[PDB]
Symmetry: D5
Subunit: 91 residues, 10 copies
Amino acid sequence: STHEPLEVLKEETVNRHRAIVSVMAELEAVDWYDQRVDASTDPELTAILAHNRDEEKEHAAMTLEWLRRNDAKWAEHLRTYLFTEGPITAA
Amino acid sequence: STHEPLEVLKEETVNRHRAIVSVMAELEAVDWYDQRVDASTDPELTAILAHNRDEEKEHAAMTLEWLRRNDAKWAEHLRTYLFTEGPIT
Amino acid sequence: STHEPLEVLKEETVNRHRAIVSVMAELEAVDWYDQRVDASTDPELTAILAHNRDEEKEHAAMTLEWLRRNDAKWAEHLRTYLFTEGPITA
Amino acid sequence: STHEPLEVLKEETVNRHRAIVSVMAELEAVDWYDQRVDASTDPELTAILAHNRDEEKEHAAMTLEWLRRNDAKWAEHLRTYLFTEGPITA
Amino acid sequence: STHEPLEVLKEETVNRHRAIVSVMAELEAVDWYDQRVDASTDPELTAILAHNRDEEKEHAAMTLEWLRRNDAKWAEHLRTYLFTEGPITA
Amino acid sequence: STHEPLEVLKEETVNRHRAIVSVMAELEAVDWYDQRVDASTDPELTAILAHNRDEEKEHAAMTLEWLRRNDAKWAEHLRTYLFTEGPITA
Amino acid sequence: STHEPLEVLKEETVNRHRAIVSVMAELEAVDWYDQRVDASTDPELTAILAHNRDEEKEHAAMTLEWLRRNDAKWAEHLRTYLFTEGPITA
Amino acid sequence: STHEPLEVLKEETVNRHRAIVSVMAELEAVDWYDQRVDASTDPELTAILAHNRDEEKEHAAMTLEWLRRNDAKWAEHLRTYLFTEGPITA
Amino acid sequence: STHEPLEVLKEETVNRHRAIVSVMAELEAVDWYDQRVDASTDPELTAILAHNRDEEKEHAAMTLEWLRRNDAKWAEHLRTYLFTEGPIT
Amino acid sequence: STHEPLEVLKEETVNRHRAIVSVMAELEAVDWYDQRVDASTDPELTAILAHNRDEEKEHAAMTLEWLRRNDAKWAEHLRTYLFTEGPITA
Ligand SMILES: [Ca+2]
Ligand SMILES: [Ca+2]
Ligand SMILES: [Ca+2]
Ligand SMILES: [Ca+2]
Ligand SMILES: [Ca+2]
Ligand SMILES: [Ca+2]
Ligand SMILES: [Ca+2]
Ligand SMILES: [Ca+2]
Ligand SMILES: [Ca+2]
Ligand SMILES: [Ca+2]
Ligand SMILES: [Ca+2]
Ligand SMILES: [Ca+2]
Ligand SMILES: [Ca+2]
Ligand SMILES: [Ca+2]
Ligand SMILES: [Ca+2]
Ligand SMILES: [Ca+2]
Ligand SMILES: [Fe+3]
Ligand SMILES: [Fe+3]
Ligand SMILES: [Fe+3]
Ligand SMILES: [Fe+3]
Ligand SMILES: [Fe+3]
Ligand SMILES: [Fe+3]
Ligand SMILES: [Fe+3]
Ligand SMILES: [Fe+3]
Ligand SMILES: [Fe+3]
Ligand SMILES: [Fe+3]
């Protein structure tokens, strides 16, 4: 899964790698589920797809908080922009 | 890009799609840069890789805040866990 | 998403496609998380990886139940083997 | 194959990996076959595609039962939702 | 699924396409199942993988027979080499 | 080219793997060439694509016969269905 | 299979595309077969893999000649370097 | 991530590899963002995408300058063509 | 080849897309050839790979100059860092 | 990069592999560039893509000449069809 040899990577880099690729997978699942919710023609399936989708967001949030706690610049940048008002590009 | 045909997708769903794949690319870039920072044996290159890495986190944070503002459940779950103390689970 | 053009596909076929690819993604997520649980050396991350893992199984079970209800042979074959005692190849 | 090196993976995790990726391929085969059944314009081929399709479901059911027997939460979540009536999300 | 636009492809070509990619998926399934049979450390799983493996070969054989019946050169070349003795490259 | 480590695979399993992926590549070439034969608007190129196409079938037939000679169930299933009449699903 | 829409591509460009992707597939087949010839531990299979490999080169040579005849710069550059004496980089 | 085994690659080659794939990822991000800027129908999102897009260009420029300083032919060819006027092919 | 439908993209954006993926392909070729130059055990082939490698850089520079002339921020950021002395950061 | 372990491949085989995948990359660049030449609406860019394209053909011809000199069947088959007048399939 790593693009550099594991011998040269420090473990904390590998642990953040494990968390990052997890967040990526969760984000992808949210998008895919959301698209299928719009396109589904069976309401019973749409309810399940929507249920799972929203839990993928929870999975991502938990993993992102870990990243914030284990990376100073994740914490800096997330504090600047998350839960803000006014233009995001100027915060 | 989209799995489903866009004719059946709502405009907001496609905009959230554009934001989600953006955050995914940022996360992927952060990971790659951090790995190359560890393996690079040229400090001047490492300085550039590290600089870019930390700005991808800014790009991800900006886009993620937009998702929070345009999706109620992103807002719900991010509020539960972000900037918290104690066991994440 | 689909291999054949949507013009020739039954809607029910496309809905089962949506359910199947979901189960595929859920199973893949279970596998990935479980491997990272074994390899992770940060206990707080392992707890998150393990927690998500087991909820992916819940997502798979729910989506799979829908397939069972909307495809007769999924229902027949799942009933033959699920929650059984003897050897499975029997 | 695996996303983590096999030295750090537990014996059981790799066996469940082999079972999981098998079910994924079976599910993928069901979907592909079913789409080609809708689009095929040769009835004898359609019969073959449909015949194989339904046996892929049997292959998946067999492997999934093994997962249930070798993973506690697969057993819990599958028992909760499989062979039920009423709203699945409930 | 196809790759030239279907408007210029003949219906028979697309049906053979549906048959060919099916045989490809069966062959791929045979190979992987066989490898997991060798590597599996759980006897109950090994039986399931091997059972499915040999049925994938059956699925492939059926589709190949269809190809033989619907393509003159498949019929010619398969008759030359299948069920023979002596060096195959002869 | 294998999920599983080569140390745990039997020699015949790895050799059959080499044959199987070859047949897959040959089958893929047949389908693509045939599609390009239908779509090509240059007859001399079409002649080349068709010539190559039909030789890929020979390559596939030769390799498949080897699988028949080195795998009992490939041999069992192929005689059941190859060079038959009536419904293929029987 | 083309990266730009077929409406804006000239007929000659799509035919050269069909030839080029064919030569690529043939080249890939030559490389894979040659590697399996080195690794194969079954001489009868090795004979087949070697036979097919060398005919892929013929398929490639035929398709390249067509490219040379239908592209001025393929003809110019191939004439410069093919069947020459001395350092190729000159 | 490298195509050749790392033991035979020079340290400088691997460092240039790290810089090159980074520039590739930056360029890819610029292209993706620019397309989403045109298609986005949400002004607040478009502002973020465009902001990030233009900073990806800065990341590429810095890494590209490093390549120029650590590769003689990058320096030569970048010297000839960047910040010029008139036909680039001259 | 594009992610968004071409109907909604500005053609100038599509032309820049054509330029970007070309440079990406050129960069990928430079890296691969350079790795094969280090690993090749045939000197005459190594000469060809090395020759091709250095011309891929020429191809990249030409296409990169076109991007600079047709994108304001390419021109701005390339003016800042190209042909400079001192720490790139 | 290789399909088989480097431990089992002959040095001559691996070098031919390096040339083959190089020719493949050049051909792919020719095809993509030629398509972008047809679709481009900016003449200054069209000039660059066309220029690069034609040099990729040169890069490919040079590498193919190396293959001709270091592989007997490439030389045999290329001599048969290259620089010929008359039906290629004859
Ligand atoms: Ca939960
Ligand atoms: Ca990417
Ligand atoms: Ca280090
Ligand atoms: Ca995936
Ligand atoms: Ca739940
Ligand atoms: Ca697959
Ligand atoms: Ca059966
Ligand atoms: Ca049967
Ligand atoms: Ca022959
Ligand atoms: Ca050889
Ligand atoms: Ca021949
Ligand atoms: Ca002509
Ligand atoms: Ca900055
Ligand atoms: Ca030259
Ligand atoms: Ca030149
Ligand atoms: Ca002559
Ligand atoms: Fe999840
Ligand atoms: Fe970024
Ligand atoms: Fe999930
Ligand atoms: Fe199966
Ligand atoms: Fe099957
Ligand atoms: Fe072949
Ligand atoms: Fe061929
Ligand atoms: Fe960046
Ligand atoms: Fe080039
Ligand atoms: Fe080139």
